[PDB]
Every structure is written in C-alpha cells, then in structure tokens.
Amino acid sequence: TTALVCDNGSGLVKAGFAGDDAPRAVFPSIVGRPRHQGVMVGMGQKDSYVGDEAQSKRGILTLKYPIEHGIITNWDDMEKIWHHTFYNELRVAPEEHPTLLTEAPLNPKANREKMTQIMFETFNVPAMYVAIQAVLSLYASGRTTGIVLDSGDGVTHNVPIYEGYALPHAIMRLDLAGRDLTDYLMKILTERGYSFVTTAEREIVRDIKEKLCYVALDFENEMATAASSSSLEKSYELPDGQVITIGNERFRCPETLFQPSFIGMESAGIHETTYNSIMKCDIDIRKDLYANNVMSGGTTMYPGIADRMQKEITALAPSTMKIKIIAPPERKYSVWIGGSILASLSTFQQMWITKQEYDEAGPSIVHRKCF
Amino acid sequence: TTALVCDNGSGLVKAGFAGDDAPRAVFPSIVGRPRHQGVMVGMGQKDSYVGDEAQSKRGILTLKYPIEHGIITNWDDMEKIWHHTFYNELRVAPEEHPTLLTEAPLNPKANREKMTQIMFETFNVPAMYVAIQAVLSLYASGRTTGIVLDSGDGVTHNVPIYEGYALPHAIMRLDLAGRDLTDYLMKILTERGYSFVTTAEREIVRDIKEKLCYVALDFENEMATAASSSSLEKSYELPDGQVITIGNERFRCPETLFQPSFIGMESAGIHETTYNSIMKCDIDIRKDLYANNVMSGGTTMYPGIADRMQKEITALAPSTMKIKIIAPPERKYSVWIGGSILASLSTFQQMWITKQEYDEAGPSIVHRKCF
Amino acid sequence: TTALVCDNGSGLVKAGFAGDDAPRAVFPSIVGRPRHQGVMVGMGQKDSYVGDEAQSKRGILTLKYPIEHGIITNWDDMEKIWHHTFYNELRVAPEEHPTLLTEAPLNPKANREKMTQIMFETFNVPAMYVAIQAVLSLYASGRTTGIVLDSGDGVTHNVPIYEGYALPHAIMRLDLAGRDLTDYLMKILTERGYSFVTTAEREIVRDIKEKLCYVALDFENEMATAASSSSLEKSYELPDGQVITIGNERFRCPETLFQPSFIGMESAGIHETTYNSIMKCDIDIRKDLYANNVMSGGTTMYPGIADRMQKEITALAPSTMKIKIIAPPERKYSVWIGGSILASLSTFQQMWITKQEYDEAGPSIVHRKCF
Ligand SMILES: Nc1ncnc2c1ncn2[C@@H]1O[C@H](COP(=O)(O)OP(=O)(O)O)[C@@H](O)[C@H]1O
Ligand SMILES: Nc1ncnc2c1ncn2[C@@H]1O[C@H](COP(=O)(O)OP(=O)(O)O)[C@@H](O)[C@H]1O
Ligand SMILES: Nc1ncnc2c1ncn2[C@@H]1O[C@H](COP(=O)(O)OP(=O)(O)O)[C@@H](O)[C@H]1O
Ligand SMILES: [Mg+2]
C-alpha cells in the first residue's frame, strides 16, 4: 500500500502520495470562523472554513493559525486540518496508508507524542513515522554531506550532517521566519499611511511581501539609493481598487533575516548562525560543510538571498575556503520531496512505527524509534 | 395554514398572502375625518373614513397620516388601518394566519414592541415576525450579496449584506423620502401662483409629482435648458379644469434627493450615503458590493434616477472598480415580494414568534427572536 | 525667551508657555462655516469661525475637524487653527518663541514633515520639536519606567519604557478613541426615539457623553440590573428645553473600549493591547512594568476605568505579579504637563531643530533629530 507524506508547516500544508515528485495538495494552514451575524435564513452556513475556502471568504472571518513558531498550539483546529486534508484534498481514507510526518529539531517532546496519539487513535493509520525536516531536505538533494538551512514560516534551523552521521550538538534553531517579516512589514507600511490591522489584511500584507520584497546585497547602498532616487519604488493594488506605493520597505522587510535587531531580538543573523554551526564541527569536516550549504523553505525565496548568504559567510570564513550556496528552484517543496524519496526507499520499510507497537508501548515509543 | 404578509409603508399599505406573486391590497395609509357641518338627515354618516374611501371623499375630510418618518405616531389610527386591511381588503380571519410585518433599521424599540403587542393581543395572530426591509428586498432579488437603498415614503435607509452576514455597523439611514419631496414641490409651485394649502391639495401635489417629476442627469445643464427654452414645460389639470404648467420644478423636486440642502438639511445626498456605507465595510468585500448595488422602494421609481446614481457612484469610487446599479421594474413592491418568498421558505417556520412564547416572555421577545 | 508647548490633540487644542502648570488656552479643534442665506446687509461677516466662537454660533454652521485619527487631513484649516492659537489665544508672535509639539507613535511621516514645514515657513518660529505623546506622559509622572496608555480623542496607543529605554517593537497603536464612542452613542440613542444627525447635535451628544457615561465593572451584571430595574436612568436637558432620558447607554458606550466588537472592529480591547505590549518585552522587565502602568489622555476620565483595567490585567497576567494602575487626577493634560517639564530642562536645549539646521537640511531633518 502507498504511504502518505504530510508536511504540516506553520504556514502551508504540503500533503500527497509517496512516489510522486510534488505535493498533491497545498493549502494554507488556517481555520476561520465568522465574526458577523447571519440574517438570510437558509444561508450563511458552515460556521468554520479551512484552507482556500476560508481564504476566499476572509472578508467576514477571523483567521486562526493552529501552528505557531513551529510548535502546535491548537489541537482541535489541527485535527480539523488533518481531516480536511485526508478527506477532501487527497480524498483517501487514512486508516489504510502508512504516514510520514515531519517536525523541526529541538521541539517539545509532547508535540510529537500527541501528534502520534492523534494519528493512531483517530485516523487509525496502519503505521507512521516522524522525520526531522532537515534530513528530508538533504535527501531531496541527493547529498550525504551538507549543512541544511531551512527557513519556513515560523522557524529557521540549521542541521550539520556528514556522510550520514548528524551532529546533534551543532544544531541551531532560530525563531525568526516569514511571519515575523510579515508583521514587521505591516508595521513599516504605516510609515507611509497604509494601515492594515485585521487578520484578513495580514493576508494582503503577506501577498505584498511575496509579490514585491527582495533582499539588498549591500544594505547601506540600497538605503541611500532609495532615499535619493525613485527607480526602486513600486506600486501594488488592493482588493478594493486602491493602489499603494512602497519604496525602500521592499528591501527593509527581508533584511530582518540578517539583522534580527530590526525587531529587537538579540540573536545573530542567519549568516552568522550558520557559520557558528559550522565552527562547532570537528576540524576535519568544516571544509566539506563550507561547500554544501543547502537552503530550503519558503522564506529563502527572496531574490538576492543566495548571493547575500554567500557574501556574508565568505566574509567570515578563512579566505582559502570555498563557500558554495546550493538553492534549487524547487526548494519551496524540498522537504516534501525528500519525504517522498525517504518513504519510497525499500530499506526504509523496516523503520515505520506500527499500530501494534503503539498498542504495546503507546506514544512514548515515537522518541525511541525516531530521532 | 397560509400566513399573511403585511408591509406597512409610511405612505401605502401593501398586504397579501404568503407565496403569491403580488400584493392583494394596496391603498394609502390615511384617515380622514369630516371638517364641515352636516345638515342632511340620514346622510353623510360613518364619521371617519380610511384609505380609498378617504381619498374619494377628500373634499370634505381632514386627511392625517398615522406614520411619520417610518415611526407609528398614532396607534389609535394604525389599529384602524390594520382593521381596515384585514376585515375589508383581504377579508380574512386574523386568528387563522401568521403575520410577517416589516420595519426599517434604527427605529425606536418601542415601535416593534408595541407592534407585536397589538398583533398578538388585538388580532390574536397565532404567530408573527418583524423582518427588516432591506433583507426582504434582497430576498426578492434572489441574491445573497448586495447593498440595498430602500427609499420609501418616510425613510431612505442603506443596508449592506455579504453572503448572508449583514454588517450592522455600516447601516446608514437618512430621513428624507417621498413626503419631503411632496412638501418641497408644494412649496416651489407657489412661484407660479398655484397655492396649495389643504391636505387634499397635498394629495393633488403628490399626483403631480408622480405623473411628471423626473431626475435630471446633469442638474445644471437641465436648469439652463429649461431657463433658456420652454421645451420641458408640461401641463397638468386639477380636478376642476384649471390647467397648471410646471417647468423646471419637475426636476427641482427630485433633485433634492441628491442635494438635501435644498430643504435646509446638511447631510450628503443618497449617492454619498451609499458610498460611505460601502467604505465602512471590510476591504475584501467592497469589490462585490460595488457590483450588487440593489435599489428598492417607491421613491426610486423616478425616471433617470438609476443613471444618475451610476454616474455619481462611478465618479466617487476608484476607477478600476466596476459599479452596477440594479433596479427591477417591480421594485415598488420588492419588500413585500421578499416577504412572500421568506414566509414561503421551508426552514423559516421555526423562527416565528408564537403566541405562547410571547405570553411567557412578553414583548421583549421580539428583540431576541427577530433581527 | 520662553518656549511654547502646543499639544495639537484630535479633539482639543492645549497650548501655553513651557514651565507653567496648566495650559494657557484650551479650545476645541474645529472650524465652522455658515450654511444659510446672509440676508441682512452689513452683517453676517467673518465667513468662517474657529474654536469657542465657532461653537457659540454652531446653530448656523457646519463644523469640521482638521485632524482625523491623530492625522492632519485639512491643512488649510489646521494652519488656520494655529494662527488662531498664536495670535488670539496666547496673543504672542511665535517668531520669538521656540515651540514644542506632540504626535502619536506609528504615524505617517509626511504628517510631521509637513507640520515642521508649516511651523518654520509660515510662523517663523526659531526652533521646534516633535515628541511622541507617551514619552511626555511619562515625564508627567516623573517615571523612567512604566507602560503608558494614552487614549485621546483620536487614537489610543500604548508605549512601554524601561529605565529610560524605549521598546519600539513592543509599541502598539489602536484607532479607537473618544470620537468612535460618541458616534456609537449617537447610534444607540436612536433606539429611544431621539435622533442626532447634525454636527451641532454631535456636539450635544459629546456633552452628553462627557456627563452621563461611566464604565461597567461587570458588563453582564450591569445589563441584568438595567433590564431588571429603572435605577440607572438619568435625564439630560437639550438646548431647546426638551429633556431626554437614557438607560444602559450610559455604560454601553464606554464599554466599546474593552469590546471593539460592538462597533464592528475585530481588534482586542485596550486591556489585551496592554497585556500583549507587556509580553512583547523582555522577561526581566515585565515584573517592573506590571506595577508601573500609567494612563493619560481625556478618554480615560470615564469613572471606573482604572478599576476595570485593574481587573482585566489581573485576569490575564500571572497571579504572583502585581498590577497597579496609576491614574493621576490631572491626566487629561498629562501630555502638555510633560511638555512643560521637558522644555524647561537645560540638558534638552541641545535637541531643538533650529531655523539654521532646517535651512541646511530641509524638513527631512525631523526624522533624524526627533524621536
Ligand atoms: N516567493 C516568496 N518570497 C518571499 N516569501 C515567500 C515566498 N513564497 C512564500 N513566502 C513566504 O514563505 C512562507 C511559507 O513558506 P513555507 O515553506 O511553506 O513554510 P511552512 O511550510 O513551514 O509553513 C509564507 O509565509 C510566505 O510569506
Ligand atoms: N412613479 C413614481 N414616481 C415618484 N414617486 C412615486 C412614484 N410612485 C410612488 N411614488 C412615491 O413613492 C411613495 C410611496 O412609495 P412606497 O415605496 O410604497 O412608500 P412606503 O415605504 O411607505 O411603502 C409615495 O410618496 C409616492 O409619492
Ligand atoms: N471627563 C470626560 N469623560 C469622558 N470623556 C471625556 C471626558 N473629557 C474628555 N472626554 C472625551 O475625551 C476626548 C478629549 O480628550 P483628549 O485627551 O483631550 O483628546 P486629544 O488627543 O485630542 O487631546 C473627547 O472626545 C471627549 O469626548
Ligand atoms: Mg518547512
């Protein structure tokens, strides 16, 4: 029987069948509930919406995100999201298909414990497994040696690997991701006058961010140019016909990745965090990691991010090293593609957690049979 | 058992049976009482007249309107109007049928409280309901989205809806309707020497307004054209053969709707009222409201009103948006037609106030079980 | 020479000389123009009126506010109000006096750029300064730490400060203030048959809101009390001598501050705004901020507000922390009082923007020198 690969991200769900080369369904991880009153008898139905139907009717709803900062926080909505996925997106009964789930490293253990408990008790899957996202990202790239950098919607973590042996003491995780940039951009758009506060208009600001934002290769030069010239300005149209114009906000918004002090956080930028993660590895394997930086996740889709990372790491590492940034165009779905590859492998079939194993050992097993 | 439908206008009473295609009885809401010395013996009986028999005899009667600005001001007359309807026009037994009334938004609570009290205690109606006018108008159009401009004889309210969920913070209401236009017409006609002062001549002026008055597409152009040429002058005959002729008055009377200052008011015309109602709704749904701009009520039957409203709203709103004014030819009875459709619904049967429920809770129950 | 402190509020202008303990001039921030026929010859002069003399004649005027939500929208009238202030209320030529201003946080930049331009070029002040209102409100209390809650007529905004250092990522701003409450009062007074559709009647409703309104310590209990008895009702005499009577509208209106879902806003009440602004801070300073809460602004004069906010934050925050609401008796002017404090300090004299620096740099200097 064909297994199911389900990557519940903080921003998007990527679910489908093992063996494909792309997710079958991709819909935002939100659940909406009406806030106005219904008056037209026989209409105004379905007090909750999930995914794209909720997105379309967002004009009258408060949109709730179940997964925050990569730690699940609202289990009812998440069971609802899983049910919608299986029964309306994939349209396949979950109880007949082995399942593969993903989680970020350094995550609360109760997270995966209850994640296993739900999948076994409610959906009755024959077996299941949980795999660190960065391992899957490295599988998608066919490499056995790389320092994965995955930057999703709420989290951003590095995982240094060498010939298949991970280095769990060299793992860094950073709570700075796309939603933080969305909020900061919503905060700096009021600096021109365009005020967005709602849960709906946060989606407009996110769409603006996707549409226009880019990373400056030398921040001060772009700041000076924008302050002294108008070739960088750009205009975007809201759903009600208004047209907003944004100037240097385009490259100020993504810059939080490299200077988290824009939002007040203390941590060092992504570049310095990756270099530090490399420096924690044995002397004999810093060379290989310096040349196998594998990116992933949505937030790493900004133009100029790859060149900026290459520059900002080569500035730190010794001159004689060869920094190489690898960023395939498909990196928005790299974790899921790796998950598909991993679930397909014949030698992997001996590693699932089965229903009877769960019956004997309960959720606690998921830590022993999954790193 | 079939339920009556009674739409109590400020100027006309529309009554009928639920499910039918049009009202059964339509007559003005006036009560006349003779103002002259009776001389003949066994003649001129029946002290007070109502409706059509009041209009016919209006030579010797003092015509009074029980309602004013959509507020029932004389219950001792409105009870007579209801009795006339039930026991002379429809000729039904009120105890055998539910009754679905109507009332504009923002009316005083005591209005519907006392309305329900009268319906339940005087007529013994087994069940009843008081549905806002704009929702009925929107049923009558077979839609679930739109912004209704229902301009009756007392009130011109403006209710926006979206997918069955009304937006009560954006319901504008402007007290300027057909009666005020009749008053302004009656005043301006003194310019030419025709002095109408008695309450029957107010009916004559209402007839002139209905027959002739029309809304200019460009007010200043029509003013200049009428001033410089007599092409627009038209003649009307009083019931005594006196031939009056009114020129620019024909559009100076309706024009007040768009320039309320003509009668001393400040508030902006109906175009601005509708636009401001739109601009207070969520940003997502504005595009859909711009294209479902229903109208209703008697006063909107003026020729050239729809074109003028299209012109003005298109002028105000952003260009990229598409405005659409919708005006069905039977919009003089849209509220009643929607009431019929509503009363004919399947699920609507649970939402009647029942005589038992009113007896247990009291007139406050209309604020709970009705919009 | 003595410097002027000129706090241009959304609903009042507070002005005077720095150092004094109270404003020299306090008059409403409105401009009025006639709207009737000026029949008499040699009378009906002064085409427009400002402030108190504009209220005096409001019966024949249309009143307009230059500022809408702490944003200047009508420059040709704000300049007019400033001229009125300088040359009629303080009666001093400004070209010899430095000026201190105020603004809300997270506000459009063009606002202050243009304000600096007007002040320098039209009035010729030697120097001027613009300071966020919460900083000044914290000077008013002599506090170097705390979380200011400034709720003016236009806007509400929290600003946390710790031992002199601001946390501009944790600043929050909410556009819900006295005027929204006044309009909601105008709306809910219709239920009782009173109608206030005029701007002059908006001034009357503002006076009613000032007088009869308070905050409910437990909203449901107050609803039960009002429904179950007529204890709360109070009467107010209109200028015409008509007397109105209002029941639970006394606290339904100031309740919107804690439930913006009354007026269609989905946002969180001021208590949740404050709690979230605190939790955005670092862990070591939350304990200090919980016990250093400060209010300001006119809108916080509703009786019982401090106790209700005490209750709400104590409901949200951990039980071991101490919640304490500092509500100075003079909080209506806290901002102006803080300005009087600030402008006197010698150490501050080096922060003025002089005419010379403006000439060298242009209006953009106000973003680099001012907070
Ligand atoms: N082309 C893009 N440019 C910038 N940001 C993007 C782009 N596409 C997506 N994003 C951002 O990335 C986030 C989603 O990325 P994603 O990989 O799906 O995270 P996750 O799966 O964990 O939820 C979104 O919040 C979005 O703002
Ligand atoms: N053809 C018309 N042109 C202009 N006004 C009209 C026309 N027919 C009716 N009216 C006006 O519409 C008003 C009655 O319409 P109606 O919608 O039924 O008011 P109500 O809300 O009380 O029911 C009257 O004031 C009448 O003058
Ligand atoms: N004693 C009061 N009780 C209730 N509301 C008040 C009181 N004094 C003023 N207000 C309201 O607060 C607003 C004025 O407060 P204010 O602080 O001066 O605003 P601004 O920022 O413009 O200076 C007015 O809208 C008024 O309705
Ligand atoms: Mg991811």
Ligand SMILES: [Mg+2]
């Ligand atoms: Mg009507």
Ligand SMILES: [Mg+2]
């Ligand atoms: Mg103020």
